[PDB]
Design a protein around this ligand. Structure first.
Ligand code: APR
Length: 167
């Protein structure tokens, strides 16, 4: 039950909001975590989602990692959403602070296309060091399902929208 979003394209929507609070008001089927390949949930969206599950995401993640080994950059896995959503799509964007290839951002957003509807942040745009505006551009050009983007910083939201109008 997404409310209050700005329509950017027929399938990309954006709202100035914290992703953990949206998950609670909207009860989404798929919340996207911006993850790293070991599902070690640090200080961004991944930390906040984990906090709200009372660390259940981290245990489940380690269990997944123990069985299956780490993800590839640009990949994903479908774990549980616990009290936030039905499912959590863990997606690993490139970490440009660690020399990974920004082109893999396209591979990262392609995982979204296996889900009809998702609530997501902007992959790689915080701790991983990609430009938010670039991340939004790849999102817009790669994702074909319905993606609802949560941008918690009001100034970044304004910047992002203004950047998108250079269409
Ligand atoms: N609670 C939040 N709600 C909405 N957007 C948020 C929130 N916290 C951060 N963001 C925004 O989401 C985008 C992604 O930030 P990160 O979560 O740091 O994502 P990423 O750059 O992919 O970092 C991946 C890394 O962060 C760790 O938490 C994670 O375990 C991995 O090591 C950025 O614009 C950031 O400002």
């Amino acid at each position: 039950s997404f409310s209050g979003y700005l329509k950017l394209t027929d399938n990309v929507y954006i709202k100035n909001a914290d992703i953990v609070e949206e998950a609670k008001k909207v009860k989404p089927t798929v919340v996207v975590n911006a993850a790293n390949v070991y599902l070690k949930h640090g200080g961004g969206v991944a930390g906040a989602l984990n906090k709200a599950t009372n660390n259940a995401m981290q245990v489940e993640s380690d269990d997944y990692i123990a069985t299956n080994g780490p993800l590839k950059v640009g990949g994903s896995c479908v774990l549980s959403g616990h009290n936030l959503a039905k499912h959590c799509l863990h997606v690993v964007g490139p970490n440009v602070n660690k020399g990974e290839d920004i082109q893999l951002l396209k591979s990262a957003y392609e995982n979204f296309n296996q889900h009809e509807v998702l609530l997501a942040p902007l992959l790689s745009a915080g701790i991983f060091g990609a430009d938010p505006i670039h991340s939004l551009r790849v999102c817009v050009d790669t994702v074909r399902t319905n993606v609802y983007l949560a941008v918690f910083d009001k100034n970044l939201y304004d910047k992002l929208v203004s950047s998108f109008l250079e269409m």
